[PDB]
Amino acid sequence: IDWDQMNNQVIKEFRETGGKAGGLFEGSPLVLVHHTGAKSGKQRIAPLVPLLDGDRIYIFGSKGGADSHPDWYHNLVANPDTVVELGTETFPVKARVLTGAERDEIYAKQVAVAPQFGDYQRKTTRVIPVVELQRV
Amino acid sequence: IDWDQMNNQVIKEFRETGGKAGGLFEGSPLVLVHHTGAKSGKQRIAPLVPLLDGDRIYIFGSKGGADSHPDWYHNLVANPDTVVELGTETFPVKARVLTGAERDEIYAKQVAVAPQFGDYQRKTTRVIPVVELQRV
Secondary structure: OOHHHHHHHHHHHHHHHOOOOOHHHOOOOOEEEEEEOOOOOOEEEEEEOOEEEOOEEEEEOOHHHOOOOOHHHHHHHHOOEEEEEEOOEEEEEEEEEOOHHHHHHHHHHHHHHOOHHHHHHHHOOOOOOEEEEEEO | OOHHHHHHHHHHHHHHHOOOOOHHHOOOOOEEEEEEOOOOOOEEEEEEOOEEEOOEEEEEOOHHHOOOOOHHHHHHHHOOEEEEEEOOEEEEEEEEEOOHHHHHHHHHHHHHHOOHHHHHHHHOOOOOOEEEEEEO
16 A cells, blocks of 8 residues: 555545545545644645544544654644645644643543544553644 | 555555554544445445444445445445444444434534535435444
8 A cells, every 4th residue: 555645646635525535535534734844844744634623623643553753743843833724724723732631631532533542542652642733 | 546446455454453544544433344235245345434432333324425325325224234343353233224313413423523524414415324333
């Protein structure tokens, strides 16, 4: 499975369907998150599965339960003013890293939607980040 | 995007990761649902995004808001005794088609997780099916 090629194809499908990617992605929550390299300044787009809790948008640095954070997490910490595409809209956001009880409560809500997040946190002692993409 | 080839690749990845497909699928709820052709008796596997509400499992015949139901829906109506793969487990299930208020309540829970389901139901006057996969 070529994930790098399938990234650009997913971005295309998302944009052409108004954020309603089809096929095997049909029912998944999905956002396109732009992120700028902490060192390079190079911009990339990450299709990510968010928690859409009411009108708020959260993303999770699970990386499959790896012992490292995903690059997009470090990029949003360094450059939190970015853009997200959700549905038919694109809007400026400020990334906010959750901590403490708020982070635990949001993580638990995601475990309730997608139980693999329980496994991911069991697999590493790294605290998996929760990032709110706050609409500006 | 070759969905037919990417079906077998997703099935492989699901089985090898214990139901924790990675890459662009990392955070999505996902089950593999076996279904037998209503006329042919031919067996197929559909990777589908369920609602995992407590310990119950529901799937949605949205078909992108099309005016027809997906083939797997007709197949489960004809042959409701089947198998689902969830996480690291595989278990026999009986498919039950929801109706009335119960169907509306479960559909609303899925719209709250994945808002595109609101769009899909707006797009067709066909009532989108909700099917519980009941563990035997």
